[PDB]
Design a protein around this ligand. Structure first.
Ligand SMILES: Nc1ncnc2c1ncn2[C@@H]1O[C@H](COP(=O)(O)OP(=O)(O)OP(=O)(O)O)[C@@H](O)[C@H]1O
Ligand SMILES: Nc1ncnc2c1ncn2[C@@H]1O[C@H](COP(=O)(O)OP(=O)(O)OP(=O)(O)O)[C@@H](O)[C@H]1O
Ligand SMILES: Nc1ncnc2c1ncn2[C@@H]1O[C@H](COP(=O)(O)OP(=O)(O)OP(=O)(O)O)[C@@H](O)[C@H]1O
Ligand SMILES: Nc1ncnc2c1ncn2[C@@H]1O[C@H](COP(=O)(O)OP(=O)(O)OP(=O)(O)O)[C@@H](O)[C@H]1O
Ligand SMILES: Nc1ncnc2c1ncn2[C@@H]1O[C@H](COP(=O)(O)OP(=O)(O)OP(=O)(O)O)[C@@H](O)[C@H]1O
Ligand SMILES: Nc1ncnc2c1ncn2[C@@H]1O[C@H](COP(=O)(O)OP(=O)(O)O)[C@@H](O)[C@H]1O
Ligand SMILES: [Mg+2]
Ligand SMILES: [Mg+2]
Ligand SMILES: [Mg+2]
Ligand SMILES: [Mg+2]
Ligand SMILES: [Mg+2]
Lengths: 321, 319, 321, 321, 226, 321
């Protein structure tokens, strides 16, 4: 039993963030920000049942693929089947590295997290000491147990989601970077959508196994659209002039550089590419640049003005509207 | 024997809050606020006897039901009733006794289809409150450690208390909780003499005092048994459904998790009253006990929490 | 053997209250706070020869009672006479949980002391994790032996006495309300009393088993008096029209009011039994009302006042003795 | 081989109230708060050859007298030879309870100190740890030891020695009262005396086991005086007016309880036995009163006065010269 | 699985620092601090190949450990900040075209990893020889007494308490003019390492607004010569 | 395989203070402080190559000599030889209270420190950590440990030579007051000396054998000088006038305690033995006075007067010129 994905109401930006990162497991981690409730856990939980079946080998927690290039493991000695879905690998609050990585073999939490989706809890409460060690091993590619005199490395490539709390401050500016881009969640105030959410929740609760039937065609239409858009990635091209055009708008924001501009063009051919259109445009980048790369900024709290206005204003003049 | 449940005198708020929770074990847990030396603990233990007998499969530790789904833990793969046992955890107990690792589901399976509680949660040992609270709202359990998925259908209620002068709970957990109950100390000696009369007569005659109010307890048991089946008939009109949440929209309430409580409780209010259509006035008798612990969470001065919930709601619902 | 109880000079307040608890073991514990080196820690240890007899089970592994309606012993709920003196057991600040309850079963120090006096010294200096197993066990009735794959409930029905110094710290407010019927002791002023006490223990230290011989014919009669209060413990008369007066007082001090009233009602009537009368009197209450509920009154820390006087400050307003 | 006691020059104050406890191990503790290098830890260790011999039972279970009331050994008492000198033992700078109390039976360290001398070095240290254990055996003469399933009593009574630096804080006001004597040690301010100190010490380092031989009869002539004092300890009488004056003085100083006020009445008897007189005179009052009743003052840093000037002024105003 | 060595775009300051560190071990370790994400871990992992022992230190706030200090907090305690090599700041790229082809870089790496090395295989090859012969030059290089008395004069003028800033420079400036082929150290080749070195061990003492290299340039030019 | 001792250029304070200590193993170790990189730890490592040879007992359980009576540690007293090289002991900054002293045969660390040299690095740190337990053999000859049921005696007689930067802070008096040797290291500021000390650092690193062969004879000459000085150390006297002068300087300078005067006489005797002349006059009292007493003076908590000039201000004023 699980809640349907498309049955949710609103939350276009957050769902848009999932739509971008899900196709490419190389853009990086993605923060999601917002107040309590709002079904943040449900949405990512709703993400589980939208994908083609992924293959296992026999039972391994990594189970990336029975035949793939990066399969550095002792099982290759045997080399030299079944189809499953994604399993969410949420970790408890105040955990310890004894099972996240392991000791002197035993498996790890990140081992089960391989190729899946790792929903980490409130990172503001979590201490930096227990998370800095392999915060995202995808950049490293595989595991590293060089500590305590061990030499085992296994793949740990997967996507991250932050899900912080905007009540006890934010993470350190150094730690905020290298993750990815931001994501804001609003709060509905119109009673119509409120009562709609209440009615949908009550109807699902009353009839668990029959509600999803009324929302069946969308749950497969979206999956088919994503599957079709998956194969269009290695065909999109970007104009040389447009590539340098953005380079004259990031500098005025005093961006750290060399990674802020490497994620826009890494994800530019996903919003303009999943619609089926091959040639990139200018206005399409407009949507993907307002939120992405904005969270870097320069951490200037001594200012009271529309922060988003800063992103679009400098962007308009360089691109000439 | 124990204290009579109906023998409690002068308290109705927490009594009603517990009564609405006993009927349908789906609203959520209830916490109770007040003052020390008031008498909250005895009433909680008095509920352990007022109950209808519930059957079992084979007197298994899970002890949920002989029938009905969701009991897949070696219960419906292919017997007496007794009564529900209230489970109290000991002080200073970590996960070793909460769930164990090697199965021995102590303190949880015995609490499944039962009552579990703890007091003075305002400085309760941490790392433990989160584990049970998240699983209380969750379906069955979280025993994923050691690579095992034997998660037992630990479905029950949760009762907690504390002290409003020694500190409160984390805001990240209070808003996730259920109903909010607050009591006080009776200031009239005319009933305090009645209170001190009890605990001084029934002690020397428990066999005599067991039948002192037996007809009332039997009437209450039959009333709750009858009212259990009356709930799945109440209907709420569309206009009144959107009439609420106008105050919540006018006020500042975090999310909608604190809104479903009114819909899932107000219907149960008329379940044991014999009614089938909801009214306007009765809403004010249940809206106050919920969503009031959240408010605007801005404690800068002395603000009456009840005044904001009640006075504003009166204008919306026309007094 | 030890210092005779009746040889203590002065200190009427402490001597009047602590003996009153023997005749009725239903009231809770007792603690005394005051200046060090003033008379405590020896009078309490001198109460080992002032206790009557009580029934006892055959070999009594439960150590509570063989002839009561509620037994819940090891060999009562399954199986279904003797007289012994009630014992007093003291525990130091050296042991830990390993022996207070115990398991493999052997009983701990807590389990053996039933319906008696359990004396611990310097409860102010008592380390934590020890009072936690005593916060509510002594006020509930039974303990938990849930460890080691079994589950037993040894009884908790006794009275514990403590004696500390109010300079090294203060107890947690939960302890200050769990207790009841306590007293405070200051130093002596009259020089002749000082001469008397300095003579004492020096006339005594010359020959231990000679000083008690002089007081032997006088100390025995006390054992007769309290036994009389055992027969007069029931049948004590207290009109309901005075119960309102004993309860109106608490509302004026804004105390919890659900322990002071019960303790006063259960102790004032018993105070008459030791005397000999049957009908209580207003004057018979003013000598015990102040001693109780003193450790429960709440006062503003900025305000400085003596609770031992403020308790009976409003006494004149109610009926004025 | 240790430095002989009858070789320290100067410091007649400490040299008088240090061997006084040898007369009778009942006066109480002794404190010497002084600066470093003044020989505080040297003269104490010299006592190992200036104590008498006392009879004791065989096998030394707890070092208890054969014929004395209140033995309560619980192993040989129900059964109702060799005399030995007292023992010397010190505890190190910090330890655990395993040796202090006892465990696996195997006796603890405190058992050996019974009827002997135990001295603690750097008493300013060992705060809140391994100190509250030694807070019951003093001023009571008994303690209870139980853990790991073994429970045995301890008839332990002795006297204590305190020494350490004076500028490392203060001792907790619970172990302080268990010390019956206190002294202050200065450094000699005189050229001739100082150089005499220098020459006297170095002469011992040349040939150790010849220097003490030059002082053999001088130290032997000292033990006879203390032996005569011990033999003449009985028959010593004090006037009634002397008794009423030895306690009336403490009223003007407000001593924290009448716990240490009896030590002075137990000190004048010992000093008079040293010379040989029987009836205690006024002389043996001012020579000892300030030595013992000096650290029992609650004056605190509130007035411009220190040392024992207040004690001398009050004593002189009450009586004397 | 690895990133090319000579394909890294940089101001050559980090490259020269690490090259002088590897050409002679017993000089310490070049700490790097000033920014984050720019090139630190990539350069450090690049140094792990195409080469005694090499280590790495993170989150600061024969064996050589270059490490990578925390940029936000700065450095550690000045008393423990020593026992290392020269300290270098982090350059921030500004030219838009530089951003253009640096973001073009590693894109083809993502497209096809086990080919990028080949695209940079030949020229990088020459690098592994440019140091191999260099090691057979340091035993055959001398220095003049006039330069020896010239050195430690800058240290004497400043407060360089701790006699280690007059040995590491002579052990480093010697090595810089020991791999090109030249045998005599020029009067200006000293300037190529003194500005980089003597940075951490100057007892900063922030009593006035001071620049990193302004002092080490002005005081050096004041006496040593313009 | 280290820097030869007879090669340090400049800073003769070390090669006098630390070298002179080896003559008479009675004064405490050196308490040098200074900046880093100046060689404060280089010369200490060099002393390991130049040390005398003493005899020890068989198997050396506690580092004791065989021809030394009265050294009753554990077994020699009841029963009351290879001439092996002495050894200096060092400890890491990370340890535990049970690490230094032998516990559950199992010996300890100080067993190797008896009649040896003990080196401590950054002694200004490590507060309460292994320094409280290291006050036994300082100002005393024995250490008492009875932990875990086994009690022994330690004859440890180490030197306790310290080091450490002074930038962090000062020391609590108890630790520092046991040091008798104390130099003051200052960095060189002469270009010729700087280039000189730069020069020979290179060739020694290139070929240590050539450097040590070059600097061979001076080490042998120094060893012979030390041996002759130690042999001729006794039979050196002093007149009365110089002793009373050395008392007067300390008395007027007001040094706390008495350990100050003891050390200076031994230092002067050892220095005049190192020179070779039997008689001693006013030559070694002008040189080794501040170096043995400057650190002891701690009467300037607020005054800003240089410490080095203070001693010589009064010395020449009273003594001699
Ligand atoms: N789109 C939605 N808007 C509002 N409420 C929703 C939405 N979807 C689901 N809900 C309901 O809102 C309630 C709160 O959701 P949920 O418990 O998943 O919150 P959460 O994201 O885990 O909260 P928190 O941020 O406090 O950890 C649930 O009853 C859920 O069914
Ligand atoms: N209606 C009542 N009002 C007040 N007290 C009552 C009432 N009924 C019973 N009591 C008695 O009041 C006492 C309260 O005991 P209880 O264990 O409930 O503590 P409490 O006052 O709730 O506080 P605490 O949290 O400190 O235990 C009991 O002796 C109980 O029998
Ligand atoms: N009536 C009395 N008044 C005062 N002291 C008395 C009296 N009777 C006996 N004593 C003796 O006076 C001494 C007081 O010591 P005691 O142990 O009673 O002090 P305390 O108040 O318990 O101190 P602490 O708090 O330090 O343990 C004991 O030796 C005790 O025997
Ligand atoms: N009368 C004396 N006064 C002072 N010192 C003396 C005297 N006689 C001998 N000494 C010598 O003075 C030194 C004192 O050493 P000791 O450790 O006992 O002193 P202390 O005052 O107890 O020191 P600390 O307070 O630092 O523990 C020893 O070397 C001892 O031989
Ligand atoms: N007399 C001297 N003066 C200065 N430096 C010297 C001298 N003799 C040798 N050196 C060299 O100076 C350097 C100092 O090294 P070393 O680490 O021992 O110094 P340090 O001052 O003791 O350091 P630290 O305080 O950091 O422990 C070494 O290279 C050493 O060979
Ligand atoms: N030659 C180069 N010049 C500038 N930036 C580069 C170069 N090579 C890689 N980068 C960028 O540097 C980033 C690596 O950041 P890194 O320095 O490892 O972070 P951190 O400083 O936290 O270790 C990569 O994302 C890459 O885009
Ligand atoms: Mg959530
Ligand atoms: Mg309770
Ligand atoms: Mg006591
Ligand atoms: Mg000493
Ligand atoms: Mg060093």
């Amino acid at each position: 039993v699980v809640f349907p994905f498309t049955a949710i109401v609103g939350q276009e930006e957050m769902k848009l963030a999932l739509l971008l990162n899900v196709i490419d497991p190389k853009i990086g981690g993605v923060m999601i920000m917002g107040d309590r409730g709002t079904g943040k856990s449900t949405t990512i939980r709703a993400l589980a049942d939208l994908l083609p079946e992924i293959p296992v080998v026999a039972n391994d927690p990594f189970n990336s693929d029975p035949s793939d290039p990066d399969l550095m493991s002792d099982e290759v000695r045997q080399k030299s089947i079944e189809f499953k879905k994604v399993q969410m690998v949420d970790l408890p609050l105040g955990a310890t590295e004894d099972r996240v990585c392991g000791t002197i073999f035993e498996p790890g939490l990140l081992a089960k997290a391989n190729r899946g989706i790792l929903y980490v809890d409130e990172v503001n409460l979590l201490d930096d000491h227990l998370v800095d060690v392999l915060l995202d091993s995808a950049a490293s590619g595989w595991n590293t147990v060089e500590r305590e005199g061990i030499s085992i490395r296994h793949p740990a490539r997967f996507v991250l989601v932050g899900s912080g709390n905007p009540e006890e401050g934010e993470l350190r500016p150094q730690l905020l970077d290298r993750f990815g881009m931001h994501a804001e969640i609003h709060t509905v105030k119109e009673p119509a959508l409120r009562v709609q959410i209440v009615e949908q929740r009550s109807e699902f609760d009353q009839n668990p196994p029959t509600f999803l039937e009324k929302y069946n065609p969308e749950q497969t239409a979206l999956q088919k659209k994503i599957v079709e858009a998956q194969k269009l990635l290695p065909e999109v091209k970007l104009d040389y002039d447009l590539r340098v055009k953005i380079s004259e708008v990031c500098s005025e924001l005093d961006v750290d550089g060399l990674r802020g501009d490497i994620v826009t063009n890494r994800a530019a051919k996903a919003l303009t590419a999943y619609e089926g259109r091959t040639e990139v445009t200018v206005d399409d980048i407009r949507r993907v640049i307002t939120l992405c790369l904005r969270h870097r900024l320069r951490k200037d709290p001594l200012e009271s003005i529309d922060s988003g206005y800063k992103v679009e204003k400098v962007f308009a003049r360089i691109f000439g509207v």
